[PDB]
Amino acid sequence: AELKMDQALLLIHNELLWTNLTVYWKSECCYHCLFQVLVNVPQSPKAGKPSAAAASVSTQHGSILQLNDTLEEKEVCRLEYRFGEFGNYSLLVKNIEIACDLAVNEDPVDSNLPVSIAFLIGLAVIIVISFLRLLLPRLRSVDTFRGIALILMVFVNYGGGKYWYFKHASWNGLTVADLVFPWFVFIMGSSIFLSMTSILQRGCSKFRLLGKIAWRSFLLICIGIIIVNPNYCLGPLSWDKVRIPGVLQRLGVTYFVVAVLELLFAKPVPECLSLRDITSSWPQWLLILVLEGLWLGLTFLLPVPGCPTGYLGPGGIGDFGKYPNCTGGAAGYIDRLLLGDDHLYQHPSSAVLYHTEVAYDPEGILGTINSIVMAFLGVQAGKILLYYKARTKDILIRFTAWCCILGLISVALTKVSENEGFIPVNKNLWSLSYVTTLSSFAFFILLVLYPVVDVKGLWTGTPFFYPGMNSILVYVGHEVFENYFPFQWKLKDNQSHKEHLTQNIVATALWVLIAYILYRKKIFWKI
Amino acid sequence: AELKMDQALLLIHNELLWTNLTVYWKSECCYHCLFQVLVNVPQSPKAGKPSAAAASVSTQHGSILQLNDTLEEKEVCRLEYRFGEFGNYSLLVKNIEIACDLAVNEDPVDSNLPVSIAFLIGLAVIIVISFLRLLLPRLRSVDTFRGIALILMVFVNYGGGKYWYFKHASWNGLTVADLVFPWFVFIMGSSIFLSMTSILQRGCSKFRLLGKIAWRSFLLICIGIIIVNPNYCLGPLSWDKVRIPGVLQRLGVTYFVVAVLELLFAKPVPECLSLRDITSSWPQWLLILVLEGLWLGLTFLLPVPGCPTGYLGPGGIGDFGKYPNCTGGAAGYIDRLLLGDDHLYQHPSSAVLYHTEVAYDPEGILGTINSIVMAFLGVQAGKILLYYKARTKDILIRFTAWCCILGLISVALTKVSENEGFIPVNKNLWSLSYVTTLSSFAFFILLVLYPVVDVKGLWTGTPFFYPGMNSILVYVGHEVFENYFPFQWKLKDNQSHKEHLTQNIVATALWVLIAYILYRKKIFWKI
């Protein structure tokens, strides 16, 4: 068969004599989208000889089919059915009123079975090791958190088994792929406060620290532009094809702003219902709220020519195809104005579901404000850790309170839905609700990890802190050596979820092993 | 115009009325080759209207043109002329006896001018720096030698300005590209003796040293197979497309054999016309001469099916096209027998001049014998350095003697010619004369470098010893990051020697700077 991954075969038999049919397909997860032509089914030449057409339908989400008379342009019937991968289905259209009935010729496969088995195998190894062991300065929980984010990042970037829930969301919502980048920004803010407090307490000058901050930011941005962004398999670099934004550029700009702000308003940590960690940094909070107001004003009030004001949508076929070139609204307009199309990301995640043609950069200029807000919430987590380190109860109470406040803000902004909130969660736009949701997740993760790993010591963070102590080396390495063996080899079946998943799991485990080897040899690179 | 790099335009005007012409081209540097059809020139339809044909001729070497009547298959005239790059030439064939006259319409460019200017600029910088400075354990000469080889290797591997004399020779002879690999084998043998003598004098066990040797050899071979050989821009690795031989595999096998031999017959260095450094290692010499006899016997006496015995030729169109699939003779036959075609090098250097279709691996199985002989001559250089270190005169006398003996052997074997000796110099075959020639070069280089750098100290080896102390890092790095900026960018003219040369010089200078930075930070990787 010619079915690709996540496709099903749909045979359409038209038993109507005097009506040609057009089949329109729509995904249930494509919001306010247009129907697209699936296949044209000619009329039956004679009674008893139904004309037949075959099409491939995507099986990742539910499908909506609309059969339309191609001359009268009126609807004969409609189906909403969830096809299964590699299934063989038939749709018969017959008189007596026109009734279309769907039949299953060959049953589909269970496409999520490899993930179910992989989790069971991983759980079995965990229990066996934990049971077997029973018979026989630096905060470890932050390293554990950063290493969990790194392991998820390596699994997702290498393919995620080609599963849609291990890829980035098209426009709105969350998948597993969308969680780790905000967590990196959060952890980097926490590390900003921890490192700077230690350095300034030891007696270092503020200008020497300023030079160190500037050097680190410059070097992060340069590595992102020159080493990570370009696809050098396509050919030598030309300026007109150079993408300026990116992941490390975002981290460098965010690090510079937040670190300089902390340095400029730095205070010694003093020596319990108190708000000292909040009120001692009120200039920081005022500047952060002004930046957030700037993001909201630009997102909702800046007029974009040939586009609605306050547009939060993917363009393409979405929003009923009314704004095909409006992917991003103000964010995309500001990117295209200051940098130009050719210096932006050319493969936005909305292209596959909404068929967008314009270039949109997820790490663009406008979302750096919300990136800074995420890093500053991480700074607050570090402030809690250092202000109340003598009291575990105080730290846990404050982590719980921040998690609850940010979760309530997320509930209010999103209305607990993918597309219907005032500000729906969106990684491409780096929305405010995106930041509050992932920040409440991060505060809860720390609420669990701090007492287990740092205070009680029931768990040492293995094997997560090994890459967490070599994050920049792991990141740049997995970018440089993505196509190399043993991370990537040729598969016997490229349309198999099982083979892709096995390959991606093996490559992630290899990066964990590399980080462990570097830890044992005491080789640590800090950018 | 549609002239590529190193092409000239040749317009052929046939003023003959009753003879069609076929133009055959042959390079003067293609040995015993066949003529190939250049262009067909129809007869002149009427007197005063000569038929015209245009062709492109390569300008790297001299050309031989033969104009043949396509019906009578007899020669009308013949030219041997050296065309210039981007020149515009005309060849007029007319009656009165048929005389063909060559005329120059547009003069060619001086293609070697960028190299002439680059050397003058480099010399000017050297004199300016040396003049300016006048106003204001580890052997350094071996590091200087290894760093010179590394700088040449990086320049050549990145393109060499696309100049033919900075590329590998097609089959026989030497260019600048063909010098550095034997020098690496020689230096590695010298380092084998120096390192092993120090380790065994310090009191280490021979089995611990054996384990270290085995680990280093295994790791070199693995890096060569997995990291250097594959082109991962083409796609994920499949076993049937994996090249087994290579540069680091050759170094690993040679290192294992020579290091184990030295370890097994190791003797303490004792404390002047004496031959102690030669007679104390007579078992090594006997085994090396037996291996050399094996190479000669296999090269000249092994019958290769469908091929002459003792064949030292490229196949293809060479040797008058008689043996088109005999590229390599016994060496290629042994490679194709033990490994198969698909695991060999698919782009041998003979393909462009001799049009060979079979795969030949320059780092194949049979030439490992001569690789071992080269490394053992390096071991002898190290023996001279350590046995007579108290006397500079003894070291210089012995370096001179070895250089002269190996040079005389090279003269006898090659008869001072490219193709007419008993064993002509050939890097693809790793010939005996190749090894003796490059070994005499290496002994002369050491004869010059040792007193200047190590004894008198007139020169410190700058800037050559910086990469010489990080050779494996420089090699693997320039292989991994070849396509990256700033080593490679898009050129305004891809048919320009000047732009290619400037790019390659800049990339080589960048690798020297990287090695200097690693030296200043005391970061040294020893495989």
Ligand SMILES: *[C@@H]1O[C@H](CO)[C@@H](O[C@@H]2O[C@H](CO)[C@@H](O)[C@H](O)[C@H]2NC(C)=O)[C@H](O)[C@H]1NC(C)=O
């Ligand atoms: C299929 O035909 C139906 C007709 O029932 C179309 O639905 C109508 O579309 C028009 C737009 O031209 C609307 O004004 C109507 O409100 C729709 N409903 C009805 C009941 O008329 C439908 O658009 C057609 N499908 C496609 C893809 O064009």
Ligand SMILES: *[C@@H]1O[C@H](CO)[C@@H](O[C@@H]2O[C@H](CO)[C@@H](O)[C@H](O)[C@H]2NC(C)=O)[C@H](O)[C@H]1NC(C)=O
């Ligand atoms: C899907 O199932 C149908 C059966 O409903 C298959 O149709 C058969 O096709 C073969 C050859 O193509 C014919 O010999 C049979 O007569 C068909 N049966 C019917 C009932 O039509 C169809 O081939 C299947 N599609 C696949 C396997 O891709």
Ligand SMILES: *[C@@H]1O[C@H](CO)[C@@H](O[C@@H]2O[C@H](CO)[C@@H](O)[C@H](O)[C@H]2NC(C)=O)[C@H](O)[C@H]1NC(C)=O
């Ligand atoms: C061009 O024609 C000449 C004829 O002068 C060919 O040279 C002869 O080639 C035959 C082979 O068929 C030899 O036996 C003769 O000895 C050659 N010389 C003479 C004087 O006859 C030449 O081979 C032709 N060129 C090509 C490319 O075929």
Ligand SMILES: *[C@@H]1O[C@H](CO)[C@@H](O[C@@H]2O[C@H](CO)[C@@H](O)[C@H](O)[C@H]2NC(C)=O)[C@H](O)[C@H]1NC(C)=O
């Ligand atoms: C090489 O030089 C000849 C001159 O000998 C060029 O021929 C001229 O071509 C132009 C247009 O193609 C004609 O208008 C002239 O009449 C031609 N002159 C002669 C004397 O034939 C030829 O174009 C040149 N080839 C190039 C520049 O590629």
Ligand SMILES: CC(C)CCC[C@@H](C)[C@H]1CC[C@H]2[C@@H]3CC=C4C[C@@H](O)CC[C@]4(C)[C@H]3CC[C@]12C
């Ligand atoms: C400091 C915080 C709270 C506020 C910062 C945002 C303010 C200063 C700015 C940012 C973008 C601005 C908007 C940008 C453009 C327009 C369109 C124009 O036709 C009317 C004004 C209006 C609608 C502006 C109103 C003020 C605005 C919202």
Ligand SMILES: CC(C)CCC[C@@H](C)[C@H]1CC[C@H]2[C@@H]3CC=C4C[C@@H](O)CC[C@]4(C)[C@H]3CC[C@]12C
């Ligand atoms: C130890 C050194 C000096 C000599 C080693 C080489 C000897 C042992 C071997 C290596 C390859 C061998 C040759 C390989 C194959 C043939 C073809 C056969 O029809 C006759 C013997 C002959 C011609 C062999 C003669 C001996 C030979 C030359």
Ligand SMILES: CCCCCCCCCCCCCCCC
């Ligand atoms: C997100 C799914 C990917 C699963 C990755 C599994 C990694 C397991 C670690 C393997 C290597 C451990 C080495 C450290 C031993 C102390």
Ligand SMILES: CCCCCCCCCCCCCCCC
């Ligand atoms: C084979 C031609 C290539 C020319 C390479 C020139 C390299 C010159 C060195 C430049 C960097 C020097 C850094 C060390 C300073 C002490």
Ligand SMILES: *[C@@H]1O[C@H](CO)[C@@H](O)[C@H](O)[C@H]1NC(C)=O
């Ligand atoms: C169906 O389409 C064909 C053209 O392919 C057309 O000739 C025919 O008339 C159409 N059917 C009806 C009922 O009009």
Ligand SMILES: *[C@@H]1O[C@H](CO)[C@@H](O)[C@H](O)[C@H]1NC(C)=O
């Ligand atoms: C030249 O070739 C043509 C075919 O292209 C042929 O017709 C003609 O006869 C040939 N010239 C002579 C003199 O035979």
Ligand SMILES: CCCCCCCCCCCCCC
């Ligand atoms: C030890 C001297 C302290 C004096 C004030 C230092 C201020 C540092 C922050 C300056 C911010 C400048 C933005 C680029």
Ligand SMILES: CCCCCCCCCCCCCC
């Ligand atoms: C006394 C030691 C001073 C060390 C360097 C301090 C100056 C660096 C300032 C960088 C500012 C960059 C702003 C874009």
Ligand SMILES: CCCCCCCCCCCCCC
């Ligand atoms: C002492 C070293 C100073 C290095 C300065 C480098 C330039 C500063 C660039 C960082 C700013 C990036 C975000 C605006």
Ligand SMILES: CCCCCCCCCCCCCC
């Ligand atoms: C020295 C005490 C001054 C207190 C000023 C008020 C601080 C208010 C902080 C606002 C924080 C808003 C986000 C939680």
Ligand SMILES: CCCCCCCCCCCCCC
């Ligand atoms: C696709 C919809 C996403 C909405 C996410 C918001 C959930 C609210 C979080 C509540 C607090 C959780 C604490 C860990």
Ligand SMILES: CCCCCCCCCCCCCC
């Ligand atoms: C996110 C998953 C948390 C648990 C992972 C457990 C891995 C193995 C733990 C056993 C080692 C315990 C060391 C103290």
